[PDB]
Amino acid sequence: NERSRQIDDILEKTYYNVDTHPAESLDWFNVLIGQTIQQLREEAWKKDNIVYSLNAFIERKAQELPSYLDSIKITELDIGHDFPIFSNCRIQYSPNSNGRKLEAKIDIDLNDRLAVGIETRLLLNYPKPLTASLPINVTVSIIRFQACLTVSLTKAEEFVPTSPNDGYFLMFSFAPEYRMEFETQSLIGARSKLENIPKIGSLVEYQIKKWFVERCVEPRFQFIKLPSVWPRSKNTREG
Amino acid sequence: NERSRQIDDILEKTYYNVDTHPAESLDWFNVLIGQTIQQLREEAWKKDNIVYSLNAFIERKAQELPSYLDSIKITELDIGHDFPIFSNCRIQYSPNSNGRKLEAKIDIDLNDRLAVGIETRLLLNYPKPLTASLPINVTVSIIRFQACLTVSLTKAEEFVPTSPNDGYFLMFSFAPEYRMEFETQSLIGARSKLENIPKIGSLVEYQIKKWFVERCVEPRFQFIKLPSVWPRSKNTREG
Ligand SMILES: CCCCCCCCCCCCCCCCCC(=O)OC[C@H](COP(=O)(O)O)OC(=O)CCCCCCCCCCCCCCCCC
Numbered sequence: 001n002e003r004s005r006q007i008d009d010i011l012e013k014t015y016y017n018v019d020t021h022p023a024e025s026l027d028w029f030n031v032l033i034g035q036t037i038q039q040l041r042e043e044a045w046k047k048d049n050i051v052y053s054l055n056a057f058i059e060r061k062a063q064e065l066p067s068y069l070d071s072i073k074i075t076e077l078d079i080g081h082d083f084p085i086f087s088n089c090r091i092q093y094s095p096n097s098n099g100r101k102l103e104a105k106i107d108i109d110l111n112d113r114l115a116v117g118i119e120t121r122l123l124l125n126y127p128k129p130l131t132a133s134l135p136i137n138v139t140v141s142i143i144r145f146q147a148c149l150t151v152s153l154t155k156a157e158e159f160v161p162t163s164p165n166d167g168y169f170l171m172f173s174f175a176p177e178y179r180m181e182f183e184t185q186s187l188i189g190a191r192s193k194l195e196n197i198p199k200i201g202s203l204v205e206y207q208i209k210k211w212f213v214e215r216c217v218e219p220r221f222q223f224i225k226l227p228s229v230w231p232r233s234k235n236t237r238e239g
Numbered sequence: 240n241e242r243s244r245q246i247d248d249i250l251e252k253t254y255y256n257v258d259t260h261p262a263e264s265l266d267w268f269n270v271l272i273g274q275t276i277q278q279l280r281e282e283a284w285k286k287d288n289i290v291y292s293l294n295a296f297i298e299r300k301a302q303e304l305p306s307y308l309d310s311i312k313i314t315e316l317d318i319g320h321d322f323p324i325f326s327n328c329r330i331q332y333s334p335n336s337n338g339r340k341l342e343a344k345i346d347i348d349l350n351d352r353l354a355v356g357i358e359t360r361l362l363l364n365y366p367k368p369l370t371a372s373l374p375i376n377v378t379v380s381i382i383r384f385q386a387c388l389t390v391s392l393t394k395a396e397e398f399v400p401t402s403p404n405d406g407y408f409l410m411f412s413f414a415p416e417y418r419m420e421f422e423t424q425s426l427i428g429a430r431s432k433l434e435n436i437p438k439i440g441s442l443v444e445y446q447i448k449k450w451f452v453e454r455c456v457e458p459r460f461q462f463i464k465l466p467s468v469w470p471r472s473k474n475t476r477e478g
Pocket residue numbers: 229230231232233234289292293296317318353354355379380381384443447450455
């Protein structure tokens with residue numbers, strides 16, 4: 001009926017005008033997340049675990065591989081050396097729930113080199129039909145990711161899973177107008193003028209953007225189940 | 240050896256001086272958490288689930304029940320109508336890891352009434368030994384909780400569980416100098432001058448503080464295992 005009045009209670013009791021209130025810097029979060037990301041990156045063996053799974057993804061998606069190509073395979077992978085900057089955090093009425101729900105809008109900007117080495121073979125018809133050409137390693141890269149991210153912690157039941165719950169979730173999503181800049185080149189440098197190098201670059205860019213839009217871009221949300229932060233002794237540690 | 244230099248990389252790349260940098264307001268977080276807390280409170284049946292578990296706790300702790308008491312039992316329970324305000328968020332070198340780890344120090348202030356109704360019986364020796372007196376309902380309350388909270392997201396392995404892992408955790412803890420103000424009274428109001436009403440109040444205050452210090456207060460941390468926020472289709476929803 002009129003939950004929203006209940007909804008304001010929140011705003012009034014947390015000193016958030018929600019219009020007048022200025023945006024907030026979020027820098028401490030940049031730092032904590034940066035710390036976990038550097039931890040994540042310092043496990044060297046991890047990249048192999050990642051490359052294995054990315055090749056699993058490609059195997060599952062093999063039928064979507066263009067006809068001129070015999071095979072694609074990730075051989076090397078760069079996870080970068082820079083961190084994602086979150087900024088400009090605004091609370092707004094989620095657009096649009098008729099004031100039922102509150103969400104945070106956040107700016108995100110990542111300037112780094114993330115790269116994949118891709119061993120590539122062509123599907124030729126000479127001398128025999130269905131001949132796999134000699135391999136050629138192509139490095140494909142992302143060099144900037146800028147986006148806007150709405151976040152909230154809800155119970156769901158207002159949102160239905162697309163392709164195959166009780167509890168509380170982190171709901172997040174990106175506005176469809178995101179910037180994701182790619183860059184493409186041969187591994188060798190004498191191979192740089194080969195015909196299919198940009199073809200590969202654009203394939204990969206396409207797929208990555210498609211994966212992304214299918215999972216995180218409005219009107220699609222990620223719904224990630226949260227644990228209780230209630231103090232329990234089985235979670236107690238010291239040092 | 241000198242990871243810390245690796246540690247600075249973070250600070251330099253996230254524009255955090257860590258000394259000069261000012262504290263940050265955190266209000267959006269107050270709002271999101273307030274939203275989940277109001278959601279948590281709008282399930283009416285939930286309080287019964289809570290009271291059941293609190294009576295389970297008391298059953299487990301029954302041997303610690305003072306001699307003059309026959310039995311204690313929670314009958315009613317108030318979860319409050321106000322929200323916890325987080326503020327003043329500083330990033331600091333965790334004290335002290337020799338610069339290895341970074342944590343956030345946060346102020347927290349809750350002004351609310353949280354209450355429990357406790358049906359209480361005395362253990363008497365007249366007429367017979369081990370006689371349970373008539374019951375009396377005592378309401379015990381917390382009316383302010385002010386504390387300082389260090390938080391970080393680590394991998395552990397530097398911290399060992401006290402009383403009965405691989406992955407990444409939310410680590411949080413409170414400084415030992417916390418404010419937790421209690422208040423105590425009879426349910427009826429003609430029963431207000433009964434001898435054992437403050438005795439009960441102080442028992443409950445003691446136990447609650449003890450539970451708290453045993454779980455969240457330095458040098459003890461809560462270590463809560465986090466899920467991957469990596470976009471996977473089994474987590475994708477829409478509306
Ligand atoms: C004076 C009475 C005040 C009212 C206290 C309850 C109302 C507020 C607390 C919310 C409901 C508490 C029970 C919810 C948890 C499910 C039941 C359960 O687990 O009990 C078994 C649990 C034992 O499980 P075990 O630890 O695994 O052995 O026992 C308790 O949790 C007893 C809790 C005593 C009352 C808590 C006092 C609340 C202090 C408020 C400030 C604390 C900040 C802590 C930070 C939280 C976020 C970081």
